[PDB]
Design an enzyme around this catalytic site. Structure first.
Site, mmCIF file in Angstrom:
data_model
loop_
_atom_site.group_PDB
_atom_site.id
_atom_site.type_symbol
_atom_site.label_atom_id
_atom_site.label_comp_id
_atom_site.label_asym_id
_atom_site.label_seq_id
_atom_site.Cartn_x
_atom_site.Cartn_y
_atom_site.Cartn_z
ATOM 1 N N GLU A 196 0.770 -1.218 0.000
ATOM 2 C CA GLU A 196 0.004 -0.062 0.001
ATOM 3 C C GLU A 196 0.807 1.267 0.024
ATOM 4 O OE1 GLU A 196 -3.592 0.629 0.103
ATOM 5 O OE2 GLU A 196 -3.337 -1.210 -1.181
ATOM 6 N N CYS A 228 -12.611 3.077 -14.678
ATOM 7 C CA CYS A 228 -13.229 4.450 -14.312
ATOM 8 C C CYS A 228 -11.901 5.404 -14.008
ATOM 9 C CB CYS A 228 -13.868 4.340 -13.047
ATOM 10 S SG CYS A 228 -15.031 5.851 -12.926
ATOM 11 N N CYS A 244 -17.429 -1.578 -17.723
ATOM 12 C CA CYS A 244 -17.965 -1.282 -16.382
ATOM 13 C C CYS A 244 -18.845 -2.094 -15.823
ATOM 14 C CB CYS A 244 -17.853 0.376 -16.051
ATOM 15 S SG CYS A 244 -18.155 0.562 -14.453
ATOM 16 N N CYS A 281 -25.122 3.678 -13.343
ATOM 17 C CA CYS A 281 -24.283 5.043 -13.266
ATOM 18 C C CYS A 281 -24.992 6.224 -13.804
ATOM 19 C CB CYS A 281 -22.996 4.650 -13.598
ATOM 20 S SG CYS A 281 -21.909 6.419 -13.816
HETATM 21 S S1 SF4 Z 1 -19.983 3.441 -15.850
HETATM 22 FE FE1 SF4 Z 1 -19.607 5.192 -14.263
HETATM 23 S S2 SF4 Z 1 -18.427 4.156 -12.716
HETATM 24 FE FE2 SF4 Z 1 -18.094 2.804 -14.767
HETATM 25 S S3 SF4 Z 1 -16.425 3.855 -15.791
HETATM 26 FE FE3 SF4 Z 1 -18.462 4.923 -16.556
HETATM 27 S S4 SF4 Z 1 -18.162 6.822 -14.979
HETATM 28 FE FE4 SF4 Z 1 -17.147 5.388 -14.082
#
Ligand code: SF4
Length: 225
Positions: free
Chosen positions: A37, A192, A202, A208
């Site tokens: 980390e 993201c 994603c 989202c």
């Molecule tokens: S869907 Fe939303 S969380 Fe996923 S990469 Fe696009 S902005 Fe980011």
């Protein structure tokens, strides 16, 4: 989207597309997670791997690190930059040897008391290495949560930071917490991203807000000036 759906979709994604073969993910221990980390805070994974391997070979245990001269630690750190991290790393090793008998502490308060370790990092160490129930909030997580839930405002201000910590706690599960926390960091690092996020790859794309509104540029908020 609902908290229960958020956790489930991220975990299912991690199972098939997540990174599980990094050195600090095999035969995990609090010491190994802590070390990784700190190295990762301001350095990319590809550069970190060789250094992580060299440190674990020279310093098998935290007591070995504590007893070594500071100059040798700084010499091995050469090339990673941001040396304040190394100075704090050595002091923390000595605190573990002195106050905790050479056994890395496994309670939140004791871990967060170590030099160079903040609230998020302490939660990461304990959740990833022992499966303890703690949420995280690094740059990667702030980006994902702020965009998915449309959290505007600069995280530099207390009220905004508090809202983000509350959201992280809401979506972080107890069952599978070690998998979920690593997955969130994976997503913010490769999917993201700061610029041109890859929505189609994603697992949160169906709910989202930023993706639906084509407004990822607004979250998280930037420092006003
Ligand atoms: S869907 Fe939303 S969380 Fe996923 S990469 Fe696009 S902005 Fe980011």
């Amino acid at each position: 989207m609902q908290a229960s759906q958020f956790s489930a979709q991220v975990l299912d994604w991690y199972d098939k597309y997540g990174r599980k073969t990094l050195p600090w993910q095999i035969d995990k221990t609090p010491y190994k997670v802590w070390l990784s980390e700190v190295m990762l805070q301001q350095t990319q994974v590809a550069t970190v791997i060789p250094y992580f391997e060299r440190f674990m070979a020279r310093f098998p245990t935290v007591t070995d690190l504590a007893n070594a001269p500071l100059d040798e630690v700084l010499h091995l750190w050469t090339g990673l930059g941001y040396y304040a991290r190394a100075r704090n790393l050595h002091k923390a090793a000595q605190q573990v040897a002195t106050l905790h008998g050479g056994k890395f502490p496994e309670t939140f308060e004791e871990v967060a008391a170590l030099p160079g370790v903040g609230r998020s990092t302490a939660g990461a160490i304990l959740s990833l290495s022992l499966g303890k129930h703690f949420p995280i909030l690094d740059g990667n997580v702030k980006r994902v949560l702020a965009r998915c839930y449309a959290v505007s405002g600069w995280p530099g201000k207390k009220e905004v930071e508090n809202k983000l910590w509350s959201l992280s706690e809401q979506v972080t599960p107890a069952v599978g917490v070690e998998r979920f926390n690593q997955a969130m960091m994976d997503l913010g690092a490769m999917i993201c991203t700061r610029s041109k996020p890859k929505h189609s790859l994603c697992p949160l794309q169906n709910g989202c807000i930023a993706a639906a509104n084509n407004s990822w540029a607004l979250y998280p908020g930037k420092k006003p000036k």
